[PDB]
Subunit: 475 residues, 3 copies
């Protein structure tokens, strides 16, 4: 129907002890504010307002970025002074027309696990019972901090008492206020006009509209959500880590039911935007971050961190730290491999142990197996780079590119002093410093000939164990 | 006594969403079918039949392999059409003589944590009470999917109702059918001849023989196992990961009571065939896979993956990815070390940081400390390989071997272009390309002499910060 | 007040199956005995005695070391024969004056999570109720092994029955004896003089003084601690790992409330002496060990192990194994970096992928990015070490030092054969073996010139795919 959702992100969040605003702390690839705005946008409300207190100039541009990603307008109201949650709703009420007749949903920006289904059931129950206010509730083993729900024996809601304003008998109430409301626009404005600051924290409690609307004879309703994590709030980093662990278990479980093997979900972190193909095995200690895409029948080996990495089908990424890179079908990466942004490994390519690639395009079937740095280079198809090689892309002042052809066989400890081009099918010997272009089919060497200095050990290392091993060898 | 166990592995397992059959999905080093057949074989039943539906030609050879490992015959019956668990038992009943007089135990191939003790207590209780059928039961917080146990107030078993055929009041029953049965051969055949397909799934429910045998006046018994994990079944990958985590905790706990320190059992995976010595410390992020053998007083450092690796006593394997290798007593491996198949590190040997070994035998006390690839090589005792060295074992067409003597001291950045032999006590200078044999006690060099081009920086890098550091140095 | 605490560390701890004494097994950076003695010393008792049985000569020096660290005297009594906990207290009673009039607290050396607050509430309750003996109790789901608390319906304590001396009805008691006592010095000595060895284990049960003092009309009190982990004991390595995991969760949670982001507390181990600055992010798979100090706004990346490493502010330590090193402000370390003792990385320095440093001082802004070993070296400010370089610090017999100036630009695959000095602003070409000093502003090369052997591939690799790629290139 015609609804308007308001997100209250004006709280200071002092218990986070962070120079970064609370609602912008991230989990599973999105900030808490981004998590809330994503779920609200999936219901497509007619209006959406975000109330910001201080840190408003630091958070407001990120609200506009989310408005661009979700493809709609997201208004922003600003609370001048921290006068409580009631005053914050009144600030967000100025961003609507004074003649607004739709429902008004109130939420906070620190409930990251809140989904569109819980909000849909909130407005659905709100309409089905024809209530003036519907509040979301849940039951916790520790109801500390939250506002307590006061109900009579017939389970009808009487009021909500805050933690700072609760008697010891009321502290024992384990049904808590989730902070997600659904109002009638007219009945709400009437309540907040009658709010009193005569409380412990000396603020305008939005929670007091429950009792105010009860004294008016209006229908007061509370919808109890059993899944407490969906409505849990974040005030400290301990709760942020708890909700991040819970959200990660649900993300991993969804991939498993889709056909993805996650050996150790406890030590496997997967962001919300990550896609994994069918019959892919993910080993412990792995984090899938950002917009990482894993194809089908892959093996993302243990202790692998991937951020915005696109991997094709049937590839193996074992013990790899990569970001902003592409890995083709059937490619083998790892173990102990470092992928910097700009890495495009072709299909059936190999980047082996102790190899670092940065801003390089390596064609189909080319292998870089051992102890090599590949920076700002272009390598063809079905080539082979010897071990202990380096693509020298820094002359001390600027960066230069290197071009390597197809079907080449470069020797071990080959230094490519860019800019240098290596033709197709070319060879370089072991220990070659390539400073000039190598034509196709040529062999490039530079190392001097081998010189053997006989019995040098017995003359310069006389009392050494090696001198005795050589003296005993002459027998 | 005289028993016959039948494993029903004919289910499709559609909720796994895998091109691999369900019962062949692995955990703790064995497939689910291998886990079940291992426990059954420890009781030594007279007959053992495995019922297979589709995927039968893909699973049947693996049943014969398990028959070879467990040293006995394992028969295989095949269900032509998926007509339910009752028809599957009838298919497996054709693999016995028609005059079989022993007990008949029925199990499934997706209960990997089932052990021989639970099966022994099943047949023992079955004999002690003289029942015609004994079924294993357990109590779960979520009894969904499982068949519900219907008992009267005197706890006598009446029937088993499937999830698809259960009233809402019967769904609330939390005592579930574990799927492990123990029958009388004659009383069983009589039941399955009277099965009806008039149910929701239109199949022959083996569970219906509980009520059929009750209507015959036969003794019906249910044995309740408190340890629900021992009889839990796998249908999706989420349950496969849950049981794998539970089985791993029990494997780790057994090692700890035997004298093995596991710092973080949550992030330590140990397969069932792994043996670890007394007073060995295992650090977080470690996986012990396959037939890996760890000696006593070892330190398997953090983030170490070992598959079929044999490590002696008093060795340290820190941050190492190894497979099909041997590590001698007192050897030091890691951190960041890659061990390929064929690696035989002698006692008190060292393979240090960023070292990869493949199909190489390195003698006692030899050290390969830094940034070295050792492939297809043989190194003697008490040698020392300089850093940044490479054993060149690939000339572009074939692979060649390298031989290194004892007590040698090879310099840094030494390229061993195989085939090359290095005598005992030999030396090679830094930056040497060894293309010919080095006699014992000789020194092999190849690098050109050092040439200093004075004030080259001020001429070719004029406006650089290095030119100002050199201009200021002349003071 | 005037108190005397006695720690009973005389037990054999046979279920640990360790050649190391039980109380010296470590967790969170301290042994169990060190954990107990640290909490006791925070209350500053007048006397402190540690009772040791066998392993006494192996544990006693570590008690004196703790006496030095905590800045007070810690006496040591020795139990000649394992005659039970009652005889052990009598042995520790000989280390006091026979005229001691203060309270006497008895504890064990295998309760590592015991803090000074629990001990303070023990003596406070002991004084407030004027009891002759106060014992700490808790409730467990599995009370096995522990001594059971026998209370009447008015909750008054009657006696403590050991596990070996308990009837089946007494085994069901879930309130257990924590083993932490508080005695009156006179009432205690009177009890232990009346102890009888007529029990199952044939020992002097210190627990029997509860019933003895009850038969004397003395006030017997039991203080129930709800937090069972604070008083839990260790007898096997399974319980040692459980308490280590619990203690780590509390250490991590304290850092989070202080302003430290711990993404995965389950896979993040932090020792008790570690300090972490505000707004530092710690990624999964990380262990902070020893006296490691992390500054503010840092990023300790995933899979990082740090022991006694001091990191400044705004630095990044990703995928790094380091120990006994210092990392300056704004420095970037990792991924895949090995820091050996003696490493002093200046501010804004860089130690990149596959780099190992050992006993080296690298100045401000100097970068060592790829595949380099730096051992026993001194590098100036704003220098740059090329990839695949090695600081040769071992001539086969002894170790030599290397000196590198400021603003230098050393080329890739440069071998520094120590002892060698490199002046400020100097350059070295790729593939240079530096055996002599390089003056400031000079360029040091040694590699021979490049030689191209045309169509060598078609002559020496005739039937190879590279020969066809070169034959097709001539078009
Ligand atoms: C572990 C891995 O990843 S391996 C992957 C990379 N593979 C390699 O490193 C392969 C390295 N192999 C080599 O360098 C070998 O020396 C090869 C393949 C060049 C051998 O080539 P050959 O067939 O022996 O060449 P041949 O002897 O016919 O002549 C080549 C010429 O170049 C010179 N030369 C050959 N190899 C080298 C070298 N490594 N360094 C310097 N000069 C060399 C020779 O002196 C000879 O010159 P001359 O005979 O005119 O004086
Ligand atoms: C970090 C680590 O892992 S270290 C482990 C491995 N250790 C090493 O790398 C040690 C490397 N050390 C070297 O190469 C040294 O140069 C040493 C040990 C050879 C020095 O040897 P010296 O006693 O100086 O030899 P000396 O000067 O008597 O004569 C040796 C001859 O070989 C030549 N030579 C010596 N070293 C080298 C070298 N590194 N490259 C090329 N040629 C060399 C010299 O020119 C000299 O020839 P000439 O005098 O006839 O012209
Ligand atoms: C991936 C990374 O980490 S990069 C980090 C480290 N960066 C590097 O490795 C840079 C390496 N760059 C080089 O070695 C280049 O060859 C440079 C910078 C020396 C080029 O210098 P140039 O301006 O070409 O020198 P120029 O040609 O004027 O003369 C230099 C002399 O030294 C010789 N020389 C130059 N480079 C080298 C080398 N790499 N090996 C051996 N000799 C060399 C030349 O033969 C020339 O001698 P000549 O002309 O008298 O016969
Ligand atoms: O497989 P190995 O022996 O480790 O590796 C060797 O052969 C490979 C091809 O087979 C080459 O790409 C490697 O350069 C070489 O070191
Ligand atoms: O111990 P360091 O200095 O890291 O290592 C150095 O000495 C070792 C012997 O002591 C040698 O094996 C290494 O090649 C050398 O780099
Ligand atoms: O940043 P890159 O290209 O990986 O690294 C390159 O430039 C750096 C400076 O920008 C240098 O320190 C490195 O030696 C060089 O390899
Ligand atoms: Mg090298």
């Amino acid at each position: 129907g015609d609804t308007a959702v308001l997100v209250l992100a004006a709280g200071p969040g002092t218990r986070m002890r962070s120079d970064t605003p609370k609602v912008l702390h991230t989990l599973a690839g999105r900030s808490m504010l981004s998590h809330v705005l994503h779920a609200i946008a999936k219901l497509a409300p007619q209006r959406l307002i975000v109330v910001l207190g201080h840190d408003h100039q630091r958070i407001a541009p990120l609200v506009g970025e989310l408005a661009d990603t979700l493809g709609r307008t997201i208004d922003v109201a600003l609370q001048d002074r921290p006068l409580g949650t009631g005053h914050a709703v009144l600030c967000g009420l100025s961003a609507l027309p004074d003649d607004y007749a739709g429902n008004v949903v109130v939420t906070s920006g620190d409930t990251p696990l809140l989904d569109a289904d819980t909000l849909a059931d909130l407005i659905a129950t709100h309409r089905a019972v024809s209530a003036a206010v519907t509040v979301l509730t849940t039951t916790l083993d520790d109801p500390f901090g939250y506002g307590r729900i006061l109900r009579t024996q017939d389970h009808e809601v009487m009021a909500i008492v805050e933690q700072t304003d609760a008697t010891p008998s009321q502290r024992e109430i384990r049904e808590v206020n989730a902070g997600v409301y659904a109002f009638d626009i007219a009945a709400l404005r009437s309540a907040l006009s009658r709010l009193s600051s005569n409380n412990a924290q000396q603020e305008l409690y939005l929670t007091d509209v429950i009792a105010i609307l009860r004294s008016d004879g209006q229908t007061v309703h509370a919808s109890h959500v059993d899944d407490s994590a969906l409505v849990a709030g974040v005030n400290n980093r301990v709760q942020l880590a708890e909700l991040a662990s819970e959200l990660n278990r649900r993300v991993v479980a969804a991939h498993q039911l889709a056909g993805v093997t996650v050996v150790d979900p406890a030590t496997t972190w997967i962001d919300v935007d990550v896609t994994i193909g069918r019959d892919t095995v993910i080993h412990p200690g792995t984090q899938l971050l950002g917009r990482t895409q894993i194809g089908g029948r892959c093996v993302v080996g243990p202790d692998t961190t991937l951020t915005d990495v696109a991997v094709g089908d049937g590839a193996s990424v074992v013990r790899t730290h990569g970001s902003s890179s592409s890995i083709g079908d059937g490619a083998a990466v790892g173990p102990f491999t470092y992928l910097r942004p700009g890495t495009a490994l072709g299909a059936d390519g190999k980047l082996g142990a102790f190899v670092e690639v940065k801003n390089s395009t390596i064609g189909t079937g080319t292998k870089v197996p051992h102890l090599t740095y590949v920076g700002d280079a272009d390598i063809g198809e079905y080539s082979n780079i010897g071990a202990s090689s380096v693509f020298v892309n820094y002359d001390g002042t600027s960066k230069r590119r290197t071009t390597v052809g197809s079907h080449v066989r470069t020797g071990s400890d080959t230094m490519f002093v860019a800019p240098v081009t290596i033709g197709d099918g070319a060879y370089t010997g072991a220990g070659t410093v390539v400073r000039e272009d190598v034509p196709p089919g040529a062999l490039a060497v530079s190392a001097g000939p081998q010189r053997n200095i006989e019995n040098w050990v017995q003359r310069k290392r006389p009392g050494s164990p090696a001198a005795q091993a050589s003296k005993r060898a002459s027998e």
